[PDB]
Structure 1
Amino acid sequence: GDQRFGDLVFRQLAPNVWQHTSYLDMPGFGAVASNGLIVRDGGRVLVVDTAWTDDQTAQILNWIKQEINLPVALAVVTQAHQDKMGGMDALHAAGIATYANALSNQLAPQEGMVAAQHSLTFAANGWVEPATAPNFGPLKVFYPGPGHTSDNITVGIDGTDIAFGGCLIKDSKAKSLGNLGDADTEHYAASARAFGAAFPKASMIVMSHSAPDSRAAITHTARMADKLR
């Protein structure tokens, strides 16, 4: 059963992994879910993505103390948008080390976001430069190329069958891709596929704006993006 905490909802996905869900009632469309991850690794917790706001991200941190009771070593934030980086201030106040794509960190100011404290960079093949992600333990970071945004990154969880597509991958039942101005409609499909190819054993795909899916989300996402070529 999903567990409630204030305005947030947590679902356990593995022994060592949870999905956090927070919501924003942006007028025009109603109530809007966003999902990130919490990972326990030995005696520390790692957070992927904040909630919509500082308050809500506070809530997350409180729930972590209450339910897991281990210190939050680092967060990785996956896109320069409110639903992934809206609670950076809360992470910083609590002494959590924050990491994001250098491009994400560059776009943040103009987006009204607070930059992560550290910047990640990527090799030509999409894998994060080891030196920029020290002591990430089970978190495997991959840049698949431009997709929903120029900056979207993805995360796999070694030891588990889970991979995080962030805002790149949409549910396998999506009727539209919901690409906006900042979407790269030329490379989207190949970027979706590259993520699939990077995490080839992952059976459960977690995503920002939908409940976790099978590998069908990847191939449906790719097919929807081909149509925009």
Structure 2
Amino acid sequence: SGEYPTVSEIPVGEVRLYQIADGVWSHIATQSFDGAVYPSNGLIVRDGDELLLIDTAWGAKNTAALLAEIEKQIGLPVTRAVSTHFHDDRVGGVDVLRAAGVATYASPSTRRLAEVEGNEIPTHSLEGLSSSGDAVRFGPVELFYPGAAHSTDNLVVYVPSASVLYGGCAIYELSRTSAGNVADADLAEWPTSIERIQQHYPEAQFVIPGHGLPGGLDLLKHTTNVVKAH
């Protein structure tokens, strides 16, 4: 689109917000990994006079900057956060959120896996997400467990008001042509998990990957192509 913030535009420690729809934003941060710097996305969704945060900004410092940018640009309190899998780009900063008064949530699986990794652990457990195809409402969003993909615990998030599908790290941006980290993945199941995402959200209008530029439902087929080419 030419409007979305890119990795080179954001120094590590800064956070950008991108308005997607009425009461729906993405947050974009950057972090060092494997000798390079990469971007990472999360989501912010308005719920009346409060905000729901989806995912941290990949570390304590970035997450503090995220909260500052939210206060500056939106001016509504973040009351709850959901982490969509156990990796540091999703949970790193949970301790900062807790210290800011945010109630943090993740599935039982995500909480267990974060503990095993030595990552920060979201406090509260999400009910009703244990089996592939499970969906639950959580304030202004639906949470969906599509099955194992990028990780065994990965969730996706849908915002019905705007037909926004937040795929998280189970969905790759269009420009990515090779697999990312796969030690936690289920490459055999990933294409089927993507089929379940599309079956549940076949009218999604905007699809946000965990890293990089948003797209449409074409990102699902693209991700399958990448996973199967690997």
TM-score by length of 1: 0.90
Q: CA deviation at 1:178?
A: 2.1
Contact 1:193 1:219 in 2 (8 A): no
- Percent identity of the aligned residues? 36
Q: How many residues align?
A: 222
Q: Distance in 1 between matches of 2:69 and 2:15?
A: 9
Equivalence for 2:14: 7
Residues 1:64 and 2:64 are matched in the alignment? no
Residues 1:126 and 2:128 are matched in the alignment? no
- For structure 2, which runs of at least 5 residues remain unmatched after alignment? none
- For structure 1, which runs of at least 5 residues remain unmatched after alignment? none
Choose which of 19, 22, 32 in structure 2 pairs with 1:25: 32
Distance change >3 Å, CA 205–CA 2, structure 1 → 2:
closer
- Render the CA deviation track for 1:101-131: whole Å, top value 9, x for unaligned: 1111001122221211111242645224x5x
Distance change >3 Å, CA 167–CA 27, structure 1 → 2:
closer
Deviation beyond 4 Å, 4+ runs, structure 1: 1-6
Q: Distance in 1 between matches of 2:122 and 2:17?
A: 24
Choose which of 130, 140, 144 in structure 1 pairs with 2:142: 140
Q: Distance in 1 between matches of 2:143 and 2:34?
A: 34
Contact 1:2 1:9 in 2 (8 A): no
- Render the CA deviation track for 1:50-70: whole Å, top value 9, x for unaligned: 011112111111122222221
Q: Distance in 1 between matches of 2:175 and 2:71?
A: 35
Residues 1:46 and 2:58 are matched in the alignment? no
TM-score by length of 2: 0.89
Distance change >3 Å, CA 191–CA 96, structure 1 → 2:
same
RMSD of aligned residue pairs (Cα, Å): 2.0
Q: Distance in 1 between matches of 2:166 and 2:190?
A: 16
